[PDB]
Amino acid sequence: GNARIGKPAPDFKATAVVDGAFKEVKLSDYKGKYVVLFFYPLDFTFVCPTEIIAFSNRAEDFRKLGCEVLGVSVDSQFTHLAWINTPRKEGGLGPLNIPLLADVTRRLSEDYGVLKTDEGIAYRGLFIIDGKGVLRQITVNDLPSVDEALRLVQAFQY
Amino acid sequence: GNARIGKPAPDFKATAVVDGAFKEVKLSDYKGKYVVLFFYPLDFTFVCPTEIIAFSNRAEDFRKLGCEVLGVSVDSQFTHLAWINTPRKEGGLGPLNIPLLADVTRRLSEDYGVLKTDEGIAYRGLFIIDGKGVLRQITVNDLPVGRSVDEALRLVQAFQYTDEHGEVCPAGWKPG
Amino acid sequence: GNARIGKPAPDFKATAVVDGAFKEVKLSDYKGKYVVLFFYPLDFTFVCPTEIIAFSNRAEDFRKLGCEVLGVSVDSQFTHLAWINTPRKEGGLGPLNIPLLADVTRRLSEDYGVLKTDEGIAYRGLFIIDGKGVLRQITVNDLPSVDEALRLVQAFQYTDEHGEVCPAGWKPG
Amino acid sequence: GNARIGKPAPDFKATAVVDGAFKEVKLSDYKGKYVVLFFYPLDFTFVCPTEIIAFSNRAEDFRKLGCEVLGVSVDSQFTHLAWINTPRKEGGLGPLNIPLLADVTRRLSEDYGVLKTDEGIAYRGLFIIDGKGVLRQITVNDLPVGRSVDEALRLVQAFQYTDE
Amino acid sequence: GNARIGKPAPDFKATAVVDGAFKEVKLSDYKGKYVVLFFYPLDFTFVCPTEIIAFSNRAEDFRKLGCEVLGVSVDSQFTHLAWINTPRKEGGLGPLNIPLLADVTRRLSEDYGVLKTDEGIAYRGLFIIDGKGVLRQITVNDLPVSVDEALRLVQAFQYTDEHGEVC
Amino acid sequence: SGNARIGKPAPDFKATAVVDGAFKEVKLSDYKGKYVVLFFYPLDFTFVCPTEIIAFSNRAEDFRKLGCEVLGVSVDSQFTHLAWINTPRKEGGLGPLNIPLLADVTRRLSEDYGVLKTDEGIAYRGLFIIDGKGVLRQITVNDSVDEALRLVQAFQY
Amino acid sequence: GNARIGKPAPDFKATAVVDGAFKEVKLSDYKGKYVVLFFYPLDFTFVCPTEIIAFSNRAEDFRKLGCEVLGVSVDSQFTHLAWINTPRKEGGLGPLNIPLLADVTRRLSEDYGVLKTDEGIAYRGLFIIDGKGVLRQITVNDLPVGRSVDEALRLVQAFQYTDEHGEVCPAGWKPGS
Amino acid sequence: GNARIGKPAPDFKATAVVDGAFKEVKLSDYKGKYVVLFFYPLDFTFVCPTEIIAFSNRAEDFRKLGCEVLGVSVDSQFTHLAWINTPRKEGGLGPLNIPLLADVTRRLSEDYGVLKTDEGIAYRGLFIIDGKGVLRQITVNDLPVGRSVDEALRLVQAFQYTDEHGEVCPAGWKPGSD
Amino acid sequence: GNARIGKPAPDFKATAVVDGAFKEVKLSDYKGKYVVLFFYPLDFTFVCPTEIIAFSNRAEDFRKLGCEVLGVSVDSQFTHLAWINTPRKEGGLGPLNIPLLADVTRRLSEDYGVLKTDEGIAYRGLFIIDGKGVLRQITVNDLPVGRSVDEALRLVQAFQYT
Amino acid sequence: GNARIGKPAPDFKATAVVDGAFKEVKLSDYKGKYVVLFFYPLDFTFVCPTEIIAFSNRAEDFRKLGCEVLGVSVDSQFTHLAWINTPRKEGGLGPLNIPLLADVTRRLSEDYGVLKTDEGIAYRGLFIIDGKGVLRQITVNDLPVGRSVDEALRLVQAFQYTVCPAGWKPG
Ligand SMILES: [Zn+2]
Ligand SMILES: [Zn+2]
Ligand SMILES: [Zn+2]
Ligand SMILES: [Zn+2]
């Protein structure tokens, strides 16, 4: 894809579930703040969404560092909302303190280089963008990390 | 895309939810049977899923005609299953007696010509495939209506009746 | 071609046979009314014209719903007129209560995505357009359903006075 | 298009009405014979007289010159047959001694340079092909009425005199 | 070449012999008149120029119709003039009432698609252009020969000009 | 941006390295059946503690425990690497190490891995994990050895 | 074109007017003799045809040297013959002692490199070709030059003398070999 | 190249050997005189340089018509000087009564259309240029032709007659015009 | 590469070790002075750095003639200062009186056509530029050791003599 | 041009004056030998031909080291011979024991990168090629007189057989 350390981070625009409702979210809304953008594969799987819950737990920890967190999968906003409104006993996520972006066109995952072209889903990926829109960190792998994410958003301010 | 009237239907294979379990589905599995293949854009929306409820309820009526009914969206099999397991009053589908196929790669939708490349979801499209794998009818709709299930069943009958007992024609018309 | 479901139907203008005379019909003539636009391959074949007879028989039924039925092949208006003026005994249509549009340039069939380019004739397509000129249904068919398109023109109108049927106990989230 | 004086005439293959029956016709069928190939815009036009009748009536005279006459329009063979079998009272042609070729794909008209592209129908065109497949005459115009069978007979003569 | 029925006719500009003097003629000069443009192979031939003299003889008939008749070959205007000066007795054309245009670059013949590439001379071709500069007739063959047919055609086109597609 | 792709064969590399005092050639095929941490850094003899490199050498055997050979990389020559190793630590230095330092003098390794900062000719701080079958599993680029250990353990269930 | 000094002259085949008749001529018809081949733009013009008349008048002096003279324009053989049959008072040439070759295809002018491509006519070119078919001299003039006939003749003689006697050579010069 | 008959000859600028010394010369120096500009392939060859010696020997007849003769090769002016000073008996020219211009860049040859492309030397082109600087004749010879010097002299007279008076015309010939 | 005798020298800009610290050195700086720009392959080699040492020693004899010398390798300015500040008993340079330019992007070596391409280091090469910016001399070979110092000295005088 | 250190030298084929006669010479005749190929601007100049003369004087010295010395300028072989045949007192070279190669097409000078494009003559350039045909040395300047022969000698020996400051040690 188009993600390059030290260059303006690839721009993005998506419908998110932000507190039970739908909002267009775009990178330019976060001018002057850090952004952790993380990608994950699929809503509603049988794997513990440790990752998503951890981030949502620590989200105010990130907000005190001047940093919003954004989750992304290829699922629609209608599926994110449903997944949030399902409780963790029937499988779901419960309420959530971070947007979940819908990447139904798959252009965000493509722009960021994390699209598993064979399967149409995102790798687990994490990107840190600074208050000026500059991509400062790239991380990509496979099976299921929030602590290092916080290390890093401090580090770039230390 | 690749869907051509009167030609072999574009091939497909997909993971589906079937009586609450994950199963792989491919067109060749249906050789010898008629197939109604219909697409819809998204699970879990606020549009009422009358089309899907109707086919599910009528599915034994299709099967009596040796026809299998398959539904498709770009959502994953995990999402389909979550939708099926969600109550109708919470916006869900409830139990269902037809496969729902996951087309997460968007290839089924591209092959059949119904992908809105903007947005990345299918148009509401419906395809009738006979027992030889030949594509015999294409329909696209703007929104659902449910006694369009009734139209699918009539066509399946019509196609099978034409395949044998000739083809209808008003009285008092002759050729040359 | 250019036909997009839920979008302004492609514009058309053609010469049609109407009441046994020629008339220039165009899309804009029909704003505020429903159009069932259907394509077929050729006039004067040995294939019984089932759908066209039926459409003309049910023509008033359609107009009693604010719907205009228009037929289309790549044959000229002269061949269409000749075809209507041929009695069904002898392979013709007899008199006819729907326009037949001439698509000699093949631009209508191209525009509506139903030109079978190898042969220069149209597939058997049916399009349903509404009073705003938005295309609301596309159907393409191997072989020759007139009652069906009639049923559909209503259920697109009770989807505007009433608002989509929906089973009992289905509510959104 | 591809038609050029003194060169091979562009090849052609089409479905024709030949004595009320459909039949494939191709240029190769006529090697060793002259061909008059005429194009006309539209079946069932009655605003003006048709040349098809005169060519049919004179077919034998062309045949005495070793020459086959072929008509072409973009109408289908079904339309060609309906026009033949239409009563003369209502403009029918009646039976014909020459083939009428269907150019529904418009490839014949395109290849011969006579497609009126804004309308999808052929201009009125007349081509004369010698027995070796070589194009010897081009005439094209946009008139609403044939022009002449007689001058096509003359030309066929003149070319065969110049051959010897 | 460029000649297409129903499209503007290929423009042309040439030096012509017009009543024993040289003149530039251009297609644009003729807007509002019909033009018959005929091409022939060679001046001073041993084949009787039956076509050119006839056009000259019938020149008034064409002018009754508002039609101009222009003959063209690849010969120069100096050859055209000498051919017109030479007596019909000793092989010439004698005086002439139609222009003869010199196509020495062979561009008129190319543009009208009548150049026999092998020989570098024109086929016998006949073109009719209406008063709006639109081409209405193309006739080309490789025979060696026509004036009454040209006269018929101009009248037929003028009729459809006035009456329309009717007849 | 280079050729490193998750789930594909990692980009091939060969370089001249410093291995416990001496120059040796390291190819990628050398580590079959073995996991590699390929880690890039910008420059030798710089003015800030080589914490990362030092950390990685100390825990070298921790990675050797896991079946994982670590491999550092900069655009500096193997002469400059050996010099750096044999400098003291005072005003600058490095000390010995139990990890190869590769010399990416051609810049082809940095380029192939997408980490070359072109306008300055040096590597970004990048780290890559490759498994015993050659397949790139992890990509990290910054501009922290504990996290690297965790990651290596995970890829083996 | 394909005219290269010191090399075989490009062959040609053309229809020519030789003493009031049409004849096919070929460069090859002239092996063993010198050829003076000259080009001019157009028959029947108002330029006095001084060089063509001079060539015609001196044609026998040329044949004494065993040299044949050929005139070329892109005019047809029918125009050439007419021009010859036209008296010089009417502006023609009168009867004529040199062939006039027709280059209606323009290939001969093109091959000899003297085709004024934007006008379709030949420059005034003059080519001297020896008895082995070798191109010995290329000349191009702007206007017709009657004195070029006298010089062509003097040059044919010089080439023939050198052919036989070798290098003319100033007194006392020797190569530095 | 750029040499067009009946158009202004291409401009040129070059160093020449004039009466034993070097002197730049350019086309505009010669406005108002005739100019025979001739090219040859190479100094110092074993080809007897008959035309250069004939032009030298007859340079005063040219000058009597106000015509300046100019020889050109791709050799340097140093080579031209040495060639002039080499005894004729060792392949030299001996003292010389016309300029030899040096064309070491190959631009005069290329502009005049006589560069033999694969060898980098000139063909023997000869160019007659009138007092108005107009290119009046192009000649190309294969070898040196002593008599091509007489020819050039007679042609220069001829052209000058034409300018004076006009082109005379045979007896009996009148155009067919009005 | 882009080096042409009698044409303006290829511009350069690089960070250098001057004395014992950093400084951007640009060609334009030297307008009006001769420049001797030499390239060598690698810092910290095991082979005696005879040519750099020699250039440093004769630095002021070069300066007498209005000419500044500059060394170049692809090594970073950090590696340069480490070499300079390493002592000669341990393979190092000791102090220098000539700037050492860092060509980490390899743009200098490419522009001067000296980049031994398949290795990424410069051949030994010497270039000489006059006060008006013109390239007057190009010398390159693949030899290990160079005695181009005396030769460079003779060449500078020569170019001024004209 | 095409001359690259460590690559095969650009091929060349030229007519040369060897011992007062013309001879074709090409790079390939020198296989197994070293070649010093030097370029100079112009024959017959007013600048004393020190380098050409010195290379001729030392030619045998080079041959004893298995090295052939070839001179090149854009002048023709006829001009070379005339220059050799002109006495040194009248500006000539006198007899010469190195080939002089004619580069009249200027392809040699272009291939080696020394053609001074505006004037069409070569820079003073000097190239050493080893017996493998590999280019080992490139030198070019615009000096009015090139002093070269001694440096060429030492270089040739240096390539054929591959000081050090104070207490400098490696590690
Ligand atoms: Zn009228
Ligand atoms: Zn004798
Ligand atoms: Zn004898
Ligand atoms: Zn002497």
Side-chain angles (χ1 to χ4, degrees), chain E residues 57-82:
Chain E
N57 285 342
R58 302 298 282 288
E60 7 156 321
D61 300 340
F62 283 92
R63 288 174 212 288
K64 279 168 198 166
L65 302 178
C67 191
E68 282 276 313
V69 178
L70 300 177
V72 187
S73 83
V74 304
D75 301 278
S76 78
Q77 61 269 39
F78 301 93
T79 298
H80 289 333
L81 176 61

Tab-separated table of all heavy atoms in Angstrom, chain E residues 57-82:
chain	number	residue	atom	x	y	z
E	57	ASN	N	-19.768	21.419	-73.290
E	57	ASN	CA	-20.937	21.698	-74.126
E	57	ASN	C	-22.167	21.976	-73.262
E	57	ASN	O	-22.777	23.036	-73.383
E	57	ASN	CB	-21.183	20.529	-75.076
E	57	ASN	CG	-20.170	20.493	-76.232
E	57	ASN	OD1	-19.507	21.493	-76.504
E	57	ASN	ND2	-20.048	19.345	-76.898
E	58	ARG	N	-22.468	21.087	-72.304
E	58	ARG	CA	-23.603	21.217	-71.393
E	58	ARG	C	-23.355	22.195	-70.242
E	58	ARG	O	-24.161	22.253	-69.270
E	58	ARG	CB	-23.969	19.853	-70.810
E	58	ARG	CG	-24.319	18.752	-71.836
E	58	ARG	CD	-25.554	19.086	-72.692
E	58	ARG	NE	-26.843	18.889	-72.024
E	58	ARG	CZ	-27.371	17.697	-71.752
E	58	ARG	NH1	-26.705	16.585	-72.056
E	58	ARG	NH2	-28.560	17.616	-71.169
E	59	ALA	N	-22.289	22.994	-70.314
E	59	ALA	CA	-21.972	23.861	-69.176
E	59	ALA	C	-23.145	24.750	-68.756
E	59	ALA	O	-23.290	25.065	-67.565
E	59	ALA	CB	-20.780	24.739	-69.510
E	60	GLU	N	-23.924	25.238	-69.728
E	60	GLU	CA	-25.037	26.133	-69.416
E	60	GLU	C	-26.134	25.384	-68.678
E	60	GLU	O	-26.671	25.891	-67.698
E	60	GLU	CB	-25.645	26.787	-70.669
E	60	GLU	CG	-25.160	26.313	-72.052
E	60	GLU	CD	-26.193	26.590	-73.140
E	60	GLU	OE1	-27.406	26.416	-72.865
E	60	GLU	OE2	-25.780	26.982	-74.259
E	61	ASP	N	-26.499	24.189	-69.154
E	61	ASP	CA	-27.456	23.370	-68.424
E	61	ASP	C	-27.091	23.289	-66.947
E	61	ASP	O	-27.939	23.510	-66.085
E	61	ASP	CB	-27.552	21.980	-69.064
E	61	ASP	CG	-28.017	22.033	-70.553
E	61	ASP	OD1	-28.622	23.049	-70.978
E	61	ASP	OD2	-27.782	21.055	-71.312
E	62	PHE	N	-25.816	23.017	-66.617
E	62	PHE	CA	-25.477	22.939	-65.204
E	62	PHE	C	-25.665	24.284	-64.547
E	62	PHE	O	-26.035	24.379	-63.363
E	62	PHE	CB	-23.996	22.451	-65.025
E	62	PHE	CG	-23.862	21.006	-65.235
E	62	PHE	CD1	-23.570	20.516	-66.431
E	62	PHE	CD2	-24.198	20.145	-64.230
E	62	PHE	CE1	-23.560	19.186	-66.623
E	62	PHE	CE2	-24.178	18.828	-64.442
E	62	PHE	CZ	-23.845	18.366	-65.639
E	63	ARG	N	-25.299	25.329	-65.254
E	63	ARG	CA	-25.417	26.650	-64.665
E	63	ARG	C	-26.875	27.040	-64.511
E	63	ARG	O	-27.189	27.863	-63.650
E	63	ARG	CB	-24.692	27.685	-65.520
E	63	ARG	CG	-23.172	27.553	-65.413
E	63	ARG	CD	-22.434	28.491	-66.372
E	63	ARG	NE	-21.174	27.906	-66.828
E	63	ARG	CZ	-20.101	27.772	-66.060
E	63	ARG	NH1	-20.123	28.192	-64.799
E	63	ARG	NH2	-19.003	27.223	-66.562
E	64	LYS	N	-27.770	26.475	-65.335
E	64	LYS	CA	-29.195	26.749	-65.121
E	64	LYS	C	-29.577	26.255	-63.743
E	64	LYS	O	-30.427	26.857	-63.076
E	64	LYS	CB	-30.097	26.107	-66.204
E	64	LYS	CG	-30.146	26.936	-67.500
E	64	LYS	CD	-30.785	26.182	-68.700
E	64	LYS	CE	-30.414	26.861	-70.074
E	64	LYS	NZ	-30.702	26.018	-71.293
E	65	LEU	N	-28.881	25.218	-63.269
E	65	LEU	CA	-29.182	24.584	-61.997
E	65	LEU	C	-28.430	25.199	-60.855
E	65	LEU	O	-28.533	24.693	-59.744
E	65	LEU	CB	-28.855	23.090	-62.054
E	65	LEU	CG	-29.595	22.305	-63.145
E	65	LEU	CD1	-29.167	20.830	-63.166
E	65	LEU	CD2	-31.113	22.395	-62.905
E	66	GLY	N	-27.652	26.253	-61.095
E	66	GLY	CA	-26.744	26.738	-60.065
E	66	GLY	C	-25.579	25.808	-59.750
E	66	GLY	O	-25.083	25.796	-58.609
E	67	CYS	N	-25.141	25.016	-60.725
E	67	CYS	CA	-24.117	24.002	-60.515
E	67	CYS	C	-22.863	24.365	-61.296
E	67	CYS	O	-22.942	24.757	-62.466
E	67	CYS	CB	-24.610	22.655	-60.979
E	67	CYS	SG	-23.609	21.291	-60.501
E	68	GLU	N	-21.710	24.225	-60.649
E	68	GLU	CA	-20.429	24.402	-61.314
E	68	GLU	C	-19.788	23.047	-61.565
E	68	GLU	O	-19.936	22.131	-60.760
E	68	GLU	CB	-19.531	25.253	-60.452
E	68	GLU	CG	-19.890	26.699	-60.548
E	68	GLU	CD	-19.254	27.338	-61.742
E	68	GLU	OE1	-18.010	27.134	-61.970
E	68	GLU	OE2	-19.999	28.011	-62.457
E	69	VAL	N	-19.139	22.913	-62.707
E	69	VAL	CA	-18.492	21.689	-63.136
E	69	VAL	C	-16.980	21.955	-63.199
E	69	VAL	O	-16.524	22.826	-63.956
E	69	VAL	CB	-18.999	21.212	-64.497
E	69	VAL	CG1	-18.229	19.951	-64.915
E	69	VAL	CG2	-20.556	20.947	-64.495
E	70	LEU	N	-16.205	21.162	-62.457
E	70	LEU	CA	-14.740	21.307	-62.328
E	70	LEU	C	-14.055	20.005	-62.746
E	70	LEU	O	-14.304	18.959	-62.165
E	70	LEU	CB	-14.399	21.632	-60.890
E	70	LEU	CG	-14.948	22.884	-60.263
E	70	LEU	CD1	-14.511	22.919	-58.780
E	70	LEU	CD2	-14.544	24.074	-60.954
E	71	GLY	N	-13.232	20.047	-63.771
E	71	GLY	CA	-12.468	18.886	-64.144
E	71	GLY	C	-11.073	18.950	-63.497
E	71	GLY	O	-10.562	20.018	-63.218
E	72	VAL	N	-10.507	17.789	-63.199
E	72	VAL	CA	-9.253	17.662	-62.420
E	72	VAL	C	-8.448	16.536	-63.028
E	72	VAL	O	-8.974	15.426	-63.202
E	72	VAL	CB	-9.451	17.306	-60.936
E	72	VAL	CG1	-8.081	17.355	-60.140
E	72	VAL	CG2	-10.484	18.143	-60.241
E	73	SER	N	-7.164	16.795	-63.306
E	73	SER	CA	-6.196	15.697	-63.451
E	73	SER	C	-4.861	16.100	-62.837
E	73	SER	O	-4.644	17.270	-62.513
E	73	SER	CB	-6.000	15.358	-64.915
E	73	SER	OG	-5.044	16.270	-65.460
E	74	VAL	N	-3.918	15.143	-62.736
E	74	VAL	CA	-2.622	15.460	-62.135
E	74	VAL	C	-1.759	16.315	-63.047
E	74	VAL	O	-0.701	16.762	-62.619
E	74	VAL	CB	-1.850	14.183	-61.682
E	74	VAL	CG1	-2.723	13.352	-60.694
E	74	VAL	CG2	-1.362	13.288	-62.859
E	75	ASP	N	-2.179	16.566	-64.282
E	75	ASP	CA	-1.378	17.435	-65.153
E	75	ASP	C	-1.313	18.855	-64.620
E	75	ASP	O	-2.178	19.300	-63.880
E	75	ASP	CB	-1.952	17.459	-66.569
E	75	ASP	CG	-2.005	16.089	-67.192
E	75	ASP	OD1	-1.023	15.604	-67.716
E	75	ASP	OD2	-3.074	15.465	-67.152
E	76	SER	N	-0.312	19.610	-65.065
E	76	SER	CA	-0.166	20.993	-64.620
E	76	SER	C	-1.126	21.926	-65.342
E	76	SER	O	-1.653	21.622	-66.412
E	76	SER	CB	1.247	21.522	-64.908
E	76	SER	OG	1.370	21.859	-66.306
E	77	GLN	N	-1.236	23.137	-64.802
E	77	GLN	CA	-2.070	24.129	-65.475
E	77	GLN	C	-1.484	24.541	-66.809
E	77	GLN	O	-2.211	25.012	-67.686
E	77	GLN	CB	-2.224	25.376	-64.605
E	77	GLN	CG	-0.911	26.048	-64.304
E	77	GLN	CD	-0.298	25.555	-63.050
E	77	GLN	OE1	-0.340	24.352	-62.709
E	77	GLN	NE2	0.246	26.495	-62.307
E	78	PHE	N	-0.156	24.432	-66.977
E	78	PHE	CA	0.458	24.730	-68.275
E	78	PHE	C	0.089	23.678	-69.297
E	78	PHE	O	-0.151	23.986	-70.467
E	78	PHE	CB	2.019	24.809	-68.154
E	78	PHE	CG	2.474	25.857	-67.178
E	78	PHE	CD1	2.709	25.520	-65.855
E	78	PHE	CD2	2.623	27.186	-67.571
E	78	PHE	CE1	3.122	26.493	-64.932
E	78	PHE	CE2	3.016	28.183	-66.643
E	78	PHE	CZ	3.300	27.823	-65.347
E	79	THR	N	0.059	22.422	-68.886
E	79	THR	CA	-0.441	21.401	-69.800
E	79	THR	C	-1.939	21.605	-70.093
E	79	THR	O	-2.356	21.571	-71.246
E	79	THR	CB	-0.176	20.043	-69.202
E	79	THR	OG1	1.244	19.930	-69.089
E	79	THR	CG2	-0.777	18.898	-70.027
E	80	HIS	N	-2.761	21.831	-69.070
E	80	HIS	CA	-4.187	22.068	-69.331
E	80	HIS	C	-4.382	23.165	-70.368
E	80	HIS	O	-5.121	22.996	-71.340
E	80	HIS	CB	-4.916	22.454	-68.042
E	80	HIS	CG	-5.065	21.330	-67.085
E	80	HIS	ND1	-5.106	20.013	-67.486
E	80	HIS	CD2	-5.286	21.335	-65.758
E	80	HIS	CE1	-5.271	19.252	-66.422
E	80	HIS	NE2	-5.428	20.034	-65.373
E	81	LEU	N	-3.716	24.306	-70.158
E	81	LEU	CA	-3.813	25.422	-71.087
E	81	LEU	C	-3.368	25.020	-72.477
E	81	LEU	O	-4.003	25.393	-73.472
E	81	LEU	CB	-2.968	26.585	-70.576
E	81	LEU	CG	-2.886	27.799	-71.476
E	81	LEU	CD1	-4.334	28.379	-71.677
E	81	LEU	CD2	-1.932	28.832	-70.880
E	82	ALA	N	-2.271	24.267	-72.592
E	82	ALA	CA	-1.850	23.926	-73.945
E	82	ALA	C	-2.837	22.965	-74.576
E	82	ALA	O	-2.929	22.880	-75.801
E	82	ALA	CB	-0.455	23.313	-73.971
